[model samples]
Every structure is written in structure tokens, then in C-alpha cells.
Target: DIKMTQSPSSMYASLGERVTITCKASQDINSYLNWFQQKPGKSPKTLIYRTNRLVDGVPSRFSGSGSGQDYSLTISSLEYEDMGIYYCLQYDEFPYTFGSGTKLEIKRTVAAPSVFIFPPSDEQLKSGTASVVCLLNNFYPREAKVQWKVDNALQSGNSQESVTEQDSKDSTYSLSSTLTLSKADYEKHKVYACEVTHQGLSSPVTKSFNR
Candidate 1:
């Protein structure tokens, strides 16, 4: 099955405020999407089916919209009990895929990530290639992008991985990115940078290593 991309993995909104969670399939699913809500100690319950139809007993404030490969689930008014994890499923293919869920919570103060870059170790530096790692810790919203550059030229082959705590806890998230290059390239460029673009930051934060 194709990948399903979801946004705002976790969110904090004021009580009675409106919030929307989005999901996008890699290709057209022909509106064969359903939204589900799962809470602690309970099975995931279907909220909307076939894109916009609400399941029986579901609240009217909950709605779904979108077409083609993009779809959304929206809450008209966020209630305390609405705090839960929501997911979208695409059953339009042979093997169905579920979107990486989104968590909704009551509003709270946000925190910026503490960014750090770990230079290559001695062994790695002496080896044919070296891998540098950048860490972003305790950022809210759980939505972030990472970029890598070698002397102002964009570098490819970077990977970002994250592990977030349960939604019931404080809603902070953490992630790390790794960039690897040959020893010759590192010596020639002499500047490797990692840039983090996050919601809490007014601007992108960059940390660089000068070889």
C-alpha cells in the first residue's frame, strides 16, 4: 500500500477552539478514506466513513472533508473529552494503510527545541566516511523539518527519526537527523550544517561544524 502522510502529529488548542487534522495519500484513493479516534484503554472507533459521513452516535461537531489524495478531519469545538489520538485509514488498495495518527489536547504553553550537533568521533573522522548527528529535544507540535548543507550547497541523503512520549504526558517531542559524507568531501567543504525549521522558532536554527 502507498504511504499516508498526516500533519500535526500532536496539537494543543484552547477549549471550544476549532482544530483540523489532515491526511494525504501518496496517490489517488478516490475518497475511500475513513477517520478513527482512539483513546487510552479503548479500541479505535470509526468517526467518519467514505470521507464525510459520520458514523452513528458520533458527535455532529466532528466532520471530514477533502478529495483525491488529500483529506481532513475537523473538530468544530474542542471539548475536554475530545482529547485523544485520531487516525485516518485508506482502504482503497489491496493492503490498506493507516496514517501515522494525530493527537489532540487542551492548549498549553509551547517550548522551543534545544538543538545540538554531535561531531564525528575520532574513529569516524579517521574512517573513510563520517556521520554527523543533530538532535532536537522537547519541541512542541511534533512537526519539524531538517536540512543539511555543505558550504552553502544543499546536501542530500539525510534521514530524520523521532520518538515521542504518550499524549497523556506533557506534549513535547524529540527527533534527530544524521548526515554522512566521505572524508575527502568533508575535508574539501570544511563546513557541515544542520538547520532545523520548527514552529516554536521564529526562524530556522542552524548549528554547524567547521572541519
Candidate 2:
């Protein structure tokens, strides 16, 4: 599956500072990564495509660049109004995939998202087939990702679609990703890791499983 993964589930930027958002794709798929910004209740605005062009009326401060699987969206000089919800959409694959939005602001503290991993039962693993579940829980503003790896090599994904929900109590959200594998895979690789990526998170929340 083609994947578009964003960083910094949330951030606080002051006026005139520079902001660069990175998006990593599963593999080289040309410049199919696109950037968008949504403020408050407004519809998402297109900023660029092919990773290097600018849309008309779009600020010159806002630019994009990245070839192949690596892409980026940059704001040269941030402004107060620049703060908002930002994410990317992949036009490279069918049924396109999108971002786990970032909340950008001028002055404020943001909490990082949390992630937990659950492995298949010992019996299941012993049976030569099992499932691993990556829970991206207690995140805000709807932006984060789940990535899987075997023996440090990224796996083909996403095995299932990302499903999201809201916490009626605190207004935060959650997303889940699941990966199933065979015993042969572990025998070949040894262990597996599940990574939860976010803009608010200083680093991706990663968990590994071995048997």
C-alpha cells in the first residue's frame, strides 16, 4: 500500500519563524505527495503539488520539495495566521491516503500523542500465524500514523484501513492499525516493531515484539 506519513502531530510556531513538515512515502512514487492546510472550520486549502510548485495566491513563504519517497512542506516565514491543521494527501495510489494532521499555533503548549502495541497470543505465534495490533491512542486534532517493520525493514502496508474516533469526554481522538504475519516471517526476521508517528511527538512511539 502507498503511505503518506507526517511528523509533529502538533506544534507551536511564533511569527517569522520557519516551519518544515516532512512526509515520507512507502516507496518512490514520483511527486504524488500533495500538501493542504485547514484553519478552524474552513475547508482544506491546496498549497502545492508534485512537491515543488505553489498554488496561486498561496504565500511565497509556503513551498514544497521532495523527490521520490521523501517530500516536505515548508513555510519560510511563519505568521500568526499560519497556525492551523495541516496534513498531506497521496495522489500516487488508488483510493488515496492522507495525513494525521498537525496543529500549528503561534504560542501554546501541545501534548504529544501516545501509542501502545499488542502482540498475538503465544499460542497464535506458535501456530505459525499471528496478528499484531498498533493502537494510536489519546491523540488530538486527528493526525498520526502506524508503521510496521520486520527485522528493521519496513513492511508492506497498510494491511487494514485507519479507523478514528473521538473521546466524548476530552475531545481527543484515537486511531488503530493492525498487521498480520506468518511464523516464517519471524523465523526470517527475528522481531517486529510498530511505530506511531505524530507531529506533536518529539519522536515516534515505537514498540517491538519478539518470540
Candidate 3:
């Protein structure tokens, strides 16, 4: 099966802006690429089929280009309704494959995230393990990185971070990360810090896990 790779997993564009989404195939499929548009709660509909050919009734603002293993879908001017998910598909072989998809969202003002560090949870503490949660709220562009530190030392383990899309009326996104350690470390009052870096902020936000 051929694999399809898409760039800019998520994008933020302003109104009337030009945006282009690109996709690459593992092998040459002889320009068998196609593009589809999907809005929230609606089925995906074809926009451009057979490489750079526009589908019937599709607006000219939505165009496709490129050939061989590389292809692109360009939007001449972004509209409010254009905020959705776009995908690329290749059907030249028996096992058809599609790109992972790109999420297109409206661009908003730059907002720094508010950081919160929660102490260890009692439930996990009772199990001889401690769990702490770091929450980031109201950030723009939905781009941020998180790290966990114990006594100022970076601890790289199984700590994972999750995010929430911009559904708020204010158009902001939120993300959270959780850290787990031994209950002994929590009881010993060891300092734990959650470091978050966002492009909207000049400096990283660091919050300590203090009760």
C-alpha cells in the first residue's frame, strides 16, 4: 500500500488569505491525486480530482497543482466557511491510500496561555504512584510545547500532553499534560515544575506544583 504524507498537520489562516496544502506519495502514482473538503459534521466532498482538474460545481478559488509523487491544493482566497479539514487521496493502485488530513482553522489574535499546576491526586497517591496535571488555557494558533522537571532537572519519561480544539466563542485553544512519579517523591515535597513554551509569548511559562 502506498503511503501519503501531508504537511502542516494544522493551519491557521485569516479571511481573504491564500493558503496551500501539500501532500506527497511514497511512489509515483502517475498524477492520480485528488483533493477533498470536509466541514464539521458533514461528509467529505470532492474538490479537485485527477491531479489539477477542478470538480464540477467547485469554486475556482479551490485549485490543485503538481504531478508525480507530489501534489498541492491551493485556496486563492479564504472564506469563513473554508475552515475545515482537507485531505488528499491516491487511487492509482489496488489499495488506495489517503493523506492523514489537514485541519484548517481561522487565525485569531495572539494570546498567551495561562498555566496551572495541580498537586498530586489522592487516588494515584493511594496506589503508591502520584499523578500531577498541568493545564494551559486560552492560547492562540494551537501551538505549544510542554516539559516536566523535578527539582529543576528535566525528566523525560512517559509524560504525555493532550490538546483541545478552538471551540470557544473567543477562538482560543487549550492543552494539558500529566506527569507520574512515585508516591515517595510526592511525600518528600520534591519541587516539580511544568514548563510551557508558546510562540505567542516572549518567555516560557513555568508553574510549580505547590499545594
Candidate 4:
């Protein structure tokens, strides 16, 4: 919740370089910043929030103006699925803080554009049938492990579903998982995954989906 991190853990831009990251809010979270964009599978994508507002259907070149606490999440022109990793969130309340991501790689001299994967259209993919949801926000010693995979396999039983967080200044957690299949297995390029693992923070952050 109150433990968010993001630095030069990795950076190598080219296709319109101008990336920036810094989301620190262990105390005052008045602006309520929020930004997301995780590639390498796909799932997270919500560029900016109360600090900049821009999450209706995203893709105006993916912009996020910025505000208090020095905010800035811009993506004027960087296609190829925008490379990968990019997060900065602060829901302005109970355990809603994140910002340990900023991976917009593609500096092989830059010259590999042609990536587009923006599913979730058509009424949000018919708004039914193929199900799969897992949201773990404001996490703590809540013993994290959100799961749900489709294309990359892994779709067993799934029954975990809980959501309750409203303490105010940090302390939240969420869980969700559903799969109905059929509808031709929700095919149309098929690929749905939302896996999150938390404990010591070794490696586990996936977000993928297709339509």
C-alpha cells in the first residue's frame, strides 16, 4: 500500500525517447496519481488518474499530463505495444500505491515499429462468457497470489473471489478469478493472463489479454 518504488531499474529508449518515472507517496497522497502499462503478456493499462485523468478508452498517443508531487506519464508516440512495463499509481486512500515500473525498451538503434494489441472493445468483449478477473490492490501480508491464465495455459479450478478495502490511508487487498470458456474459447487471437505473486518480490507480475 504505502510502499511504492520506481527508478532507473532499466531504461533504453529510442522511438521518441522521453520517458520518466517517480511515484513516491508514503504520506501525502492528495493528487491521487495513477498510471499503468505492463507488457510482455499484457494486462495492466490505465495511464494516469486523478492527477491527470485520461482513462476512458486510452490511445490518443497515450497521454498523462501530471500534477502534484511532480507527476508525469507521457507517451506521445511510442508504439510496439509501447514496449513494456510502466506504472505509477496512488489511489489517494487505503493501501493504493504503486510505482515500481518504467520499462519502455527498444533501443537497438530503434526501428521496429508495428505493434498493436488493444482488445476489450465490442462492448468490452461482449461483457460476458469468457471470464477472468483478478485485482489485488493495497496489498500487505495478505498473502498475495492472484491468478488466471488462458492462452499461456494454466486454467484449473479457480474459486478465489474477495474484495474488501476501505480503511483510508493504506491497507487494502483484492482477489478475482473466473473462467467460463466457450464462445469458441474466446478466440480472436486468444491470450488472457493476469498472474501476480507477492511475498519477497522475486518475480511475478503478468497481465495479458486478447480479443
Identify the candidate with maximal lDDT: 3
State the displacement of the C-alpha of residue 113, model 2, in Å, after optimal TM-score superposition: 27
**52-131 in candidate 3: lDDT tens per residue?**
89999988998889788999988999776677899999998978898999999888688889999998876777788888
Output the better candidate (1/2) by lDDT.
1
**Segments of candidate 3 deviating more than 4 angstroms:** 1-12, 20-34, 38-85, 90-107, 164-171
- Candidate 2 deviant stretches above 4 angstroms: 108-211
Q: How do all the candidates rank in terms of lDDT, highest first?
A: 3, 1, 2, 4
Model 3, backbone clash pairs (residues 3+ apart or across chains), number = 0
lDDT-better candidate, 2 vs 3: 3
TM-score of the candidate numbered 2?
Answer: 0.50
- Model 4 per-residue lDDT tens digits across residues 21-76: 55555666767777887765558877667866777877776666645455666666
Clash totals for all candidate models: 0, 12, 0, 8
Cα displacement (Å) at residue 166, model 4? 43
What's the true lDDT of residue 13 in model 2? 62
| Pairs in clash, predicted candidate 1 | none
Writing each residue's lDDT as its tens digit, candidate 1 over 81-162 gives 6778899999899799999999877775677888899888899877788878888887776667788886898776554465
Best by TM-score: 3
Prediction 4 TM-score vs. true: 0.22
lDDT of each: 0.83, 0.74, 0.85, 0.59
By descending TM-score, how would the candidates be arranged?
3, 1, 2, 4
